[PDB]
Amino acid sequence: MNIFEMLRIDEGLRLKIYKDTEGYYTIGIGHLLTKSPSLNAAKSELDKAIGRNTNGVITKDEAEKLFNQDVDAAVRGILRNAKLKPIYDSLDAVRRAALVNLIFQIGETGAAGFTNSLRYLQQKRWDEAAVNFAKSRWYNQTPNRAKRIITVFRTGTWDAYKNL
Ligand SMILES: [Cl-]
Ligand SMILES: [Cl-]
Ligand SMILES: [K+]
């Protein structure tokens, strides 16, 4: 288990544009294209991203390329965010992966509302952090995925992703 295998499980792989859990145009391994309701707008974003006129369809290799860029950028942004970097640095590698996964899904701005939960993680109050993370729109909207991420933050093990 590692961050890529973890996010590959949570996001799946689709080589044609599709709508994510929020209704937004996405492709590949959870690569958000745009929040716009315009398919054409999403297709333009895809072409920009891949570097060619794709028509809404990409290769597995291309999907993987954007995926690598997304995870890298996610970690990197965590490191530049003063509200997140200290949390990240305080955790072990397993929990760190859980935090990258959360940000990949909700974005830094999304995480702005997780100050309390993040603080419990920094305090290493695992159970409390877990309880706190569940009290969120994120949890309510994607509970199965959230449960997984929360168990990871709670135990520091990949048990929730085994058998997946
Ligand atoms: Cl991109
Ligand atoms: Cl879910
Ligand atoms: K997805």
Positive or negative: CA dihedral 135, 146, 87, 29: negative
- Please give the helix or strand (H or E) that residue 50 lies within, else none: helix 39-50
Q: At how many Å resolution was this determined? A: 1.6
How many angstroms separate the CA atoms of 2 and 8, rounded? 10
Which residues lie closer than 8 Å to 51 by C-beta, 6 or more apart? Answer: none
Distance 13 CA to ligand 3 centre (A): 7
**In this structure, which amino acid lies at residue 112?**
A
Look at residues 66, 5, 71, 11 and name the one whose alpha carbon lies nearest to residue 33: 66
Q: Could you confirm whether 47 is annotated as catalytic?
A: no
How many A from CA of 44 to the centre of ligand 1?
Answer: 11
What string of DSSP letters covers 99-158?
HHHHHHHHHHHHHGGGHHHHHHHHTT-HHHHHHHHTSSHHHHHSHHHHHHHHHHHHHSS-
- Placement of tokens 């993680």 in the chain: 121
Which of the residues 10, 11, 45, 62 is marked catalytic? 11
Active site residue 11: yes
Write down the experimental method used for this entry: X-ray
Ligand nearest the Cα of residue 145 is 2
DSSP 39: H
Q: Please state, as a whole number, how many other Cβ atoms lie within 10 Å of the Cβ of residue 38.
A: 11
- The DSSP string of 58-80 is --HHHHHHHHHHHHHHHHHHHHH
Residue 75, CA distances (Å) to 85, 125, 140 in order: 9, 23, 25
Question: Could you say which of 5, 10, 20, 47 is catalytic?
Answer: 20
What the chain holds in terms of domains, given with CATH numbers, is 1-164 (1.10.530.40)
How far apart are alpha carbons 73 and 137 in whole angstroms? 24
Is 33 annotated as ligand-binding? no
